[PDB]
């Protein structure tokens, strides 16, 4: 019983045969969920069955959120996305409000359901198809196709906008003090209210979403032992502002001074006022790499100087909404992880680091994924776009564990690469 709203035309970029990605293996645990959840979707009519005739395909996987609702269905549509047309409906319909980042807290709502109340272009469903597999391949593949707007497809938000706006219209009008952002399947609500006051306000908006357009949002799950829910809230008022890359000591060896100059030479790309020849002269001889301790008094006056130069925020911050965002993450230390976000190389727009995780959960891939997910969270609240990740791992490894740790509704683009001592120099800025 989908809305009587008309079918908005949807077509893709020229010369793009749409998605045709194959499905990766899934755990029995995931299958069951990905099943019961999709079958009901058949009855509800938001999905129908289709056979081999549809040569297109996109992947799906279940992720177990820690909320009162149930499993979450995720249809990786990154491809279909890029393949899909340019939707002005978002170009204007989804303008990022600056003050969003400036708030005492912000909450994340999964409002995916809202997209079932609207139908999808009759002539486009062939591009949403996914295939649920089975253990040991008992049977062949069961392939479902979308009828309504698919959760997590760049087009979906774009279209639904008008509806989402009128719905929130009352709430925002009531307490205009609140700034609401829409991103794919999430609703970002920030306020400078008190944690308790904020929660309640959220719940209100969560209530409203019920009475109107049967917008049902996942219901969180609270408990006692280790209180995770207390941190579900997203406070960006004290968001890690990078500025912890320094070096200092007394009696320095050749090795030391040598390494130091090596650093600065590269740093000269991020900071102009840099004098490298100074120390280079201090060590202009085939001296012993080790014991050698060329204690200089002249270098000091300039060594502290480079610091004065790169003293605070660098003059270069310039976000151009025409360019993509890039994120770089490197394994700097045990448990600790560092990251940077740039549009142009060596001119980073922001920096940061995913530190030690307060919990016995020890897993490299996990630490990384959690990092990327939290990095993305930031990139969203600010610029509003998701940065391309240059992952510090091999395609193979990531591809066999990233799912068993992901938890967000949206998914970022990512590629695999390796880093040199330049970045791993503990001087992250790339």
């Amino acid at each position, epitope marked *: 019983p989908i809305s009587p709203i008309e079918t908005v035309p949807v077509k893709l970029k020229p010369g793009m045969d749409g998605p045709k990605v194959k499905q990766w293996p899934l755990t029995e645990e995931k299958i069951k969920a990905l099943v019961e959840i999709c079958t009901e979707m058949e009855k509800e009519g938001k999905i129908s069955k289709i056979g081999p005739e549809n040569p297109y395909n996109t992947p799906v996987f279940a992720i177990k959120k820690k909320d009162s609702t149930k499993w979450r269905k995720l249809v990786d549509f990154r491809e279909l996305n890029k393949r899909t047309q340019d939707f002005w409906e978002v170009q204007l319909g989804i303008p990022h409000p600056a003050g969003l980042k400036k708030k005492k807290s912000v909450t994340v709502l999964d409002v995916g359901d809202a997209y079932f109340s609207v139908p999808l272009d009759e002539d486009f469903r062939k591009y949403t198809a996914f295939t649920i597999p089975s253990i040991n391949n008992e049977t062949p593949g069961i392939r479902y196709q979308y009828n309504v707007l698919p959760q997590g497809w760049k087009g979906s938000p774009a279209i639904f906008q008008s509806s989402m706006t009128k719905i929130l219209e009352p709430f925002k009008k009531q307490n205009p003090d609140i700034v609401i952002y829409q991103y794919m399947d999430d609703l970002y609500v920030g306020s400078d209210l008190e944690i308790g006051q904020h929660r309640t306000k959220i719940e209100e908006l969560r209530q409203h979403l019920l009475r109107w357009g049967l917008t049902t949002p996942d219901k969180k799950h*609270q408990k*006692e032992p*280790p*209180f995770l829910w*207390m*941190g579900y809230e997203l406070h960006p008022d004290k968001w890690t502002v990078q500025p912890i890359v320094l070096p200092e000591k007394d009696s320095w060896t050749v090795n030391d001074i040598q390494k130091l100059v090596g650093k600065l030479n590269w740093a000269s790309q991020i900071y102009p006022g840099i004098k490298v020849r100074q120390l280079s002269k201090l060590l202009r001889g085939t001296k012993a790499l080790t014991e050698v301790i060329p204690l200089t008094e002249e270098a000091e006056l300039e060594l502290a100087e480079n610091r004065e130069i790169l003293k605070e925020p660098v003059h270069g911050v310039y976000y151009d909404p025409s360019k993509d965002l890039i994120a770089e993450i490197q394994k700097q230390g045990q448990g600790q992880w560092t990251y940077q976000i740039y549009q142009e190389p060596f001119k980073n727009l922001k920096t940061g680091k995913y530190a030690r995780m307060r919990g016995a959960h020890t897993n490299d891939v996990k630490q990384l994924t959690e990092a990327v997910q939290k990095i993305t969270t930031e990139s969203i609240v600010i610029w509003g776009k998701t940065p391309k990740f240059k992952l510090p791992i091999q395609k193979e490894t990531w591809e066999t564990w990233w799912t068993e740790y992901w938890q967000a509704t949206w998914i970022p683009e990512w590629e695999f690469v390796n880093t040199p001592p330049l970045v791993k120099l503990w001087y992250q800025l790339e």
Partner: antibody
Amino acid sequence: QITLKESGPGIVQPSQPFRLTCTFSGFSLSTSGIGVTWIRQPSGKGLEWLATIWWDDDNRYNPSLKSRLTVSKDTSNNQAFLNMMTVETADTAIYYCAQSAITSVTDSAMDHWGQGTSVTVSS
Amino acid sequence: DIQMTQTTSSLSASLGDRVTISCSASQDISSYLNWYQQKPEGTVKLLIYYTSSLHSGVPSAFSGSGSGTDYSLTISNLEPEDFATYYCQQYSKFPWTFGGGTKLEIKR
């Protein structure tokens, strides 16, 4: 600051039941971190945990009493309650209520109590 | 449902003295232990949380200590008011349990 006083029947014939009340002033059983906890202190014994009432309606009892124990809370008038059925000798003790609050991600203790009531069980 | 045991039942000390109370658990509570002080007059007040963090309004002398399944509570220099019963509490497994407090009486 916030405070909570309790009140009971004072005396209850064994096998009969009773109802204790905790009238609090300061917080609310409608705030993510708040809560109300009933602790019983038997004659000469130490402190025993009976049950704890939580904002989200999630109530929890002691596995040993839930059978003859039930809690409540008229949120509108800042009052939580403790109901005990079929009371036997032992139960004669001083019951206290306490405002419990999940202060933060790692902290959750009983912050404020109040001299409890004395319920006596005798024929 | 963790068996909480406060070994030392009732100790004796004097003004100026230093006292340490021993609370033992039945399984790593990850510091989920509190400290309640019940004065002879009946009233029970909150001293500290996280087996370490000092509760707003409680004097420095009250320091938190402990790890694993063995924790401790120590008062720097005992003053006439600190002579009461100290109840140890845990909060990992929901059946909140108090391990018979430790009496801190006047040594005469």
